[PDB]
């Protein structure tokens, strides 16, 4: 005993975690001429809104920084997030180690708390010159992450970029002409890059839902002639049907 019913499914939730690499690696230089543009670039492709994607931001160098937490205003609203990026051009200065590891585990502690939105698309950008504290470490996470179904596409910034590192935490093939995981040139080709990840699709699909056993049928409303009765059951779905009501006779009437 179950019921049918037809739905759109789109997949216009995505929770987008941006993990940002302000370590002293990248270069001031290129933090100011090529970093900040490129996250004004990128965030600005981003149609941020309550129902489809929300952005998470956290920037990671010797600690790891939580700037943007999924579901406020500056998670659903692009310019309340390119305010996030002007404010870091303008205080911030990328120095110490690179704790890569941490900022990936945010992600997965995400996922672990049941923070994210379950019907959402799981998608990581992580933007670095691949050089973190522990390349292990840093890759063990990542393919965890994988593991959970979360898709993760890399942005190489900063002075010195190891693509091998990049390349290999991307999962990019050896041989194989442009990775559709890595990008490393401006933001045109990031914004590219990220937009399979993120599309808008909408399918009609067929769905299932167990409506669980019934009450036993109710008396007949009458004792004598025709009468009606009734069963009930606890609604285990939305589109589950709850009562229904059938003919009954006991007999005839005198
Ligand atoms: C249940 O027991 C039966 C043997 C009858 O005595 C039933 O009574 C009758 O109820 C019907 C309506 O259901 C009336 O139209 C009759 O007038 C009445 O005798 C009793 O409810
Ligand atoms: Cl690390
Ligand atoms: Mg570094």
Redesign the pocket.
Known sequence: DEVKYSEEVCNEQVDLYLLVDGSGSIGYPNWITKVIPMLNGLINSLSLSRDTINLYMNLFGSYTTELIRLGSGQSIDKRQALSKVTELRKTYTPYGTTSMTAALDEVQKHLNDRVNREKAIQLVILMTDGVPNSKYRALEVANKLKQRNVRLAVIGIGQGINHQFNRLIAGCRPREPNCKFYSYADWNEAVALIKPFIAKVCTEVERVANCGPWDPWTACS????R?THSRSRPSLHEKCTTHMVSECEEGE?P
């Open positions: 009458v004792t004598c002639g009468g009437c």
